[PDB]
Amino acid sequence: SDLPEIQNGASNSEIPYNGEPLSWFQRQLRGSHYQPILRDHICKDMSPL
Amino acid sequence: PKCPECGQHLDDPNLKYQQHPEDAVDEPQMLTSEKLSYEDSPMHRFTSFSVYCSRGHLCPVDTGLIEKNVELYFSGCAKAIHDENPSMEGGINGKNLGPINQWWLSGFDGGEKVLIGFSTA
Ligand SMILES: [Zn+2]
DSSP: OOSOOOOTTOOOSEEEOOSOOOSHHHHHHHOSSOOOEEEOOOOOOOOOO | OBOTTTOOBSSOTTOOBOOOOSSOEEHHHHHSOTTOOOOSSOOOEEEEEEEEETTOBBOOSTTSTTTTTOOEEEEEEEEOTTOOOOSSTTOEEEEEEOOOOEEEEEOSSSSSOOEEEEEOO
16 A cells, blocks of 8 residues: 555666555565665556557 | 866856755764764765865866865765665754765675765874
């Protein structure tokens, strides 16, 4: 639920989080500290159809 | 019209002058800040930095002006070594931070950790 909005065919590997962790679970996988880069929030470029 | 300190031209249309922040305390003062917690020299992060000549011209570093004996000074928000945040949040502001001795680099082996670092007395 925390991850910033992306659009079909997103290719930028490193991007800012733009927001804090929302769920417990999120807090746990991001670490009890700050980290700027969000890595691999990239999704497939699906056919226009 | 040329700067007698950095050489830059005055009709150069990229040329810019330095704008301090208020807080802006000089180097020794800021260093004695609690926002900061194997060298006999402190080691801090530093954000929103600017480099300039005595006359206040923004200046590159790679151009070897430090090596031609030219005093370059800097300013921004010093942060706590562990502090990952590049916003000016948990930082104290410095100004005319002592003439730059050396400038260095590191990160040429492992990951993309090419960190640029300034050295002061
Ligand atoms: Zn100058």
